[PDB]
Amino acid sequence: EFKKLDDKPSLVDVHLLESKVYHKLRNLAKSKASLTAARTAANSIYCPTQTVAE
Amino acid sequence: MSTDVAAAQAQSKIDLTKKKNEEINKKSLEEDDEFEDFPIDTWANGETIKSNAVTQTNIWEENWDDVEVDDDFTNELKAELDRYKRENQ
Amino acid sequence: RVPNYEVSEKAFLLTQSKVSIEQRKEAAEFVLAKIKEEEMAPYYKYLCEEYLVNNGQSDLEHDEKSDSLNEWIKFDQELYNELCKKNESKIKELNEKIQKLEEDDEGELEQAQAWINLGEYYAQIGDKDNAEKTLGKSLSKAISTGAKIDVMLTIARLGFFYNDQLYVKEKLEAVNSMIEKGGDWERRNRYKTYYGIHCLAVRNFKEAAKLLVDSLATFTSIELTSYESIATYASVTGLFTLERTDLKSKVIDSPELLSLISTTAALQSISSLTISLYASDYASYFPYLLETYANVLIPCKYLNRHADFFVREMRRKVYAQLLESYKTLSLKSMASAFGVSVAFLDNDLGKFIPNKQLNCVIDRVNGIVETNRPDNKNAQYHLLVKQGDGLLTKLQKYGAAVRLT
């Protein structure tokens, strides 16, 4: 629903959680796919310290 | 019917008019087709043409079965028995 | 369409009596429920046609058996009266509505689509004969290629519903002709899984193995059994067909299997077997063998025929990999590895060895097992010369036939 309404600096966080999820289920197919996503979301720069550290 | 692989002997031969009578003769030489004596001889219909899965009907591929003994009974008796002997050692 | 493969799958459990008592009984309750709702009363009676006075039969519709552990199959004439009421009603109403759509004229589109709507009802109530006719009229009238793929498949699904494997067989040759003409990928995924399950039901697991890996990566769920079931089919084919290396690489490079972990008993028993087999642990290989038997083959429609074939072949593979790694083993060392006594092992080896797909011999007095399986030039020689006799033989007969004619 927030792909339709994306204007949030907050979805960088969602992307990072998802990547962790998939890593610990042990698939790298979509662990990889989500890390790329979060990185694309952090190109426009609006991230706290904590967010980049993650 | 067929003999051997069905397509390998089916394509090989057909009736011509020249050969036709001559086949009839080889059958008669034997005396009967030998597939109308066999039902008479059992005195109803067979009982052991149903003995195995491939024997029953030729629609499945081979499974190389001829004993029909389930192996799950014998394997459970093996597992449990080695374990008790070792435990009470 | 969709409820149909659930019913068929549950019913299968009542067909056997080698499954657990408590698993068959919950499954029976389910089936009665959808007998009422989905009108599955004709298929209830069909199970009784497939016994004749065989275990699983206790029916009050016809003959009954008291050696059955099934007792939840017992019909009523309440079941029968409820049927005639429902059948009669539904059909009269729904056809009437469909008839008016044919009357309103547009040949390619309106009529063709009206003809599909009959085939869903007849599929639902599990009559193959009436479904085929009405859906035949649809195919005859020009419609989109995807639709044609859908409808041929729909017919082929009624062959797995009754379990007449041949019925599936014929019809899917028609999919393979229309798959490229349509040239659609949506339904390409579905095809690979259907023809996959066909191969699964017969003894050709090599074809299945190549089709079913694809099924994991991308899945369409229409008219196909639940996805946890599709993982269980993939693991069966991989273990049976492929050897250490290929098998190993396959289940580490399939994320789909790994992200799902265990989620039903059948999936768990299959997955356990897998790890033990390539990892070279034979202690725990053997409990898993027993476990697969109970919870994987017997419940599945398409592997219950192979129940015994499966255990047979699997003991050969395990032994093959072991024999590969050793020049010699001692029988006692080889027994301790499995977790089975000394005498227990000798029987098992001795059923495989004269057939000669284990290619080892046993010095009994020395207690060693020796391995004289060639992998050299001598091995290649054995393969080749056997094929070359076969070339001669093929030319001999076809030669003779043409010279004479």
Swiss-Prot record, chain A:
N-acetylated by NAT1. It comes from the Eukaryota. Belongs to the proteasome subunit S9 family. Component of the lid subcomplex of the 19S proteasome regulatory particle complex (also named PA700 complex). The 26S proteasome consists of a 20S proteasome core and two 19S regulatory subunits. Present with 16800 molecules/cell in log phase SD medium. Component of the lid subcomplex of the 26S proteasome, a multiprotein complex involved in the ATP-dependent degradation of ubiquitinated proteins. In the complex, RPN6 is required for proteasome assembly. This is 26S proteasome regulatory subunit RPN6. It comes from Saccharomyces cerevisiae (strain ATCC 204508 / S288c) (Baker's yeast). The lineage of its organism: Eukaryota, Fungi, Dikarya, Ascomycota, Saccharomycotina. The gene is RPN6. The chain holds residues 164 to 217 of 434 of the full protein.
From Swiss-Prot, chain B:
GO terms for cellular component: cytosol; proteasome complex; proteasome regulatory particle, lid subcomplex; proteasome storage granule; transcription export complex 2. The keyword Phosphoprotein applies. Keywords: Acetylation, Phosphoprotein, Proteasome, Transcription. InterPro entries: DSS1_SEM1. The modification N-acetylserine is found at residue 2. The modification Phosphoserine is found at residue 12. It holds the Pfam family DSS1_SEM1. Disruption phenotype: Impairs mRNA export and transcription elongation, and induces strong transcription-associated hyperrecombination phenotypes. SMART domains: DSS1_SEM1. GO terms for molecular function: molecular adaptor activity; protein folding chaperone. GO terms for biological process: double-strand break repair via homologous recombination; filamentous growth; maintenance of DNA trinucleotide repeats; mRNA export from nucleus; positive regulation of transcription by RNA polymerase II; proteasome assembly; proteasome-mediated ubiquitin-dependent protein catabolic process; regulation of cell cycle. Part of the 26S proteasome. Associates with the nuclear pore complex (NPC)-associated TREX-2 complex and the COP9 signalosome. Interacts with CSN12 and THP3. Versatile protein that might stabilize multiple protein complexes involved in diverse pathways. Subunit of the 26S proteasome which plays a role in ubiquitin-dependent proteolysis. Also associates with the TREX-2 complex that is required for transcription-coupled mRNA export, and the COP9 signalosome, which is involved in deneddylation. Belongs to the DSS1/SEM1 family. Present with 5590 molecules/cell in log phase SD medium. PANTHER family: 26 PROTEASOME COMPLEX SUBUNIT DSS1, 26S PROTEASOME COMPLEX SUBUNIT SEM1. This is 26S proteasome complex subunit SEM1. It comes from Saccharomyces cerevisiae (strain ATCC 204508 / S288c) (Baker's yeast).
Curated annotation (Swiss-Prot), chain C:
It is found in: Nucleus. Gene3D superfamilies: 1.25.40.570. The modification Phosphoserine is found at residue 58. PROSITE patterns: PCI (PS50250), TPR (PS50005), TPR_REGION (PS50293). Keywords: Nucleus, Phosphoprotein, Proteasome, TPR repeat. It comes from the Eukaryota. Residues 204-376 form the PCI domain. Its main location: nucleus. GO terms for biological process: proteasome-mediated ubiquitin-dependent protein catabolic process; ubiquitin-dependent protein catabolic process. GO terms for cellular component: nucleus; proteasome complex; proteasome regulatory particle; proteasome regulatory particle, lid subcomplex. GO terms for molecular function: structural molecule activity. TPR repeats lie at residues 112-145. SMART domains: PINT (SM00088). The 26S proteasome is composed of a core protease, known as the 20S proteasome, capped at one or both ends by the 19S regulatory complex (RC). The RC is composed of at least 18 different subunits in two subcomplexes, the base and the lid, which form the portions proximal and distal to the 20S proteolytic core, respectively. Component of the lid subcomplex of the 19S RC. Component of the 19S cap proteasome complex which acts as a regulatory subunit of the 26S proteasome, involved in the ATP-dependent degradation of ubiquitinated proteins. This is 26S proteasome regulatory subunit RPN7. It comes from Saccharomyces cerevisiae (strain ATCC 204508 / S288c) (Baker's yeast).
